[PDB]
Amino acid sequence: EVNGTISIGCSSLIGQTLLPEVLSLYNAQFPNVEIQVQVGSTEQIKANHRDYHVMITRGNKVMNLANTHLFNDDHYFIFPKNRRDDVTKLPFIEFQADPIYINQIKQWYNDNLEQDYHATITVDQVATCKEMLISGVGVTILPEIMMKNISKEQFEFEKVEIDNEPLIRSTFMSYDPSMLQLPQVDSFVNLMASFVE
């Protein structure tokens, strides 16, 4: 019977989406495990890797750990339908992430709106960015996992393609193989790997 504590570190948006779904199943199966969750940037979580049994991050694989690819996100440029004719003049909401990923977003904007990229609003979290969009602050690109409960009546969703290939963002589960001896950690890793497949 599985006991003890599990300490999970994850990308901020993962704490709002995938991790809650998985922990609902995990706790139901393994009720005696104490669960600790810290969220932050992928950079922050990677830096504090020693504090976590398991990490769920986005972008590239984590150095010197076992990595399991969970899924990829497509992306959508999102803007209000009532302002379609004025999309080039609406403020763009940028979130913080690694340069390779953000530069893809900037390049897409430059190429497709036919003008220099400029972010009027900059936020750290994708979740913050999502709420700025919803409240009418401006336009943005979001990963598909963050598009739940955005009004299809109010907003147009344009799939973000670069040379007819989708812009994608990967999500990885990472951990030190020596944590798998802990049944709470093994049970989580096995459940996560099963959930996505």
Q: For binding to its own copies (CB under 8 A), which residues are involved?
A: 12, 15-17, 20-21, 23-24, 27, 31, 33-39, 91, 120-125, 127-128, 131-132, 134-138, 149
Contact present, 56 and 171 (Cβ < 8 Å): yes
Residue 171 interacts with Na ion (CB under 5 A)?
A: no
Using CA atoms, how far residue 55 sits from 67, 129, 145, 174, in Å, is 9, 23, 18, 5
The rounded distance, in Å, linking the Cα atoms of 148 and 61 is 26
162 binds, among Na ion, its own copies, none (CB under 5 to 8 A by kind): none
Distance of CA 26 to the CA centre of its chain: 20
Least distance (Å) between residue 54 CB and its own copies: 15
Nearer to its own copies, 13 or 167 (CB): 13
> Which entry of its own copies, Na ion, none binds 104, CB below 5 to 8 A by partner kind?
none
User: What single string gives the DSSP state of each residue in 130-183?
Assistant: HHHHHTTS-BEEEEGGG-TT--TTTEEEEE-EETTEE--EEEEEEE-GGGTTSH
Partner whose footprint covers residue 127, from its own copies, Na ion, none (CB < 5 to 8 Å by kind): its own copies
44 binds Na ion (CB under 5 A): no
Report if residue 95 touches Na ion, rule: CB under 5 A. Answer: yes
Asked if 96 interacts with Na ion (CB under 5 A), we say yes
Site for Na ion in 135-154 (CB under 5 A): 140-141
The closest alpha carbon to 30, from 139, 170, 189, 136, belongs to 189
Inter-residue contact 13 to 28 (CB < 8 Å)? no
* Binding partner selected for residue 121 from Na ion, its own copies, none, CB under the kind-specific 5 to 8 Å limit: its own copies
Q: How many CB atoms lie within 10 A of CB 45?
A: 25
The smaller minimum CB distance to Na ion, of residues 158 and 186, is found at 158
Q: Which positions lie near Na ion, rule CB under 5 A?
A: 95-97, 140-141
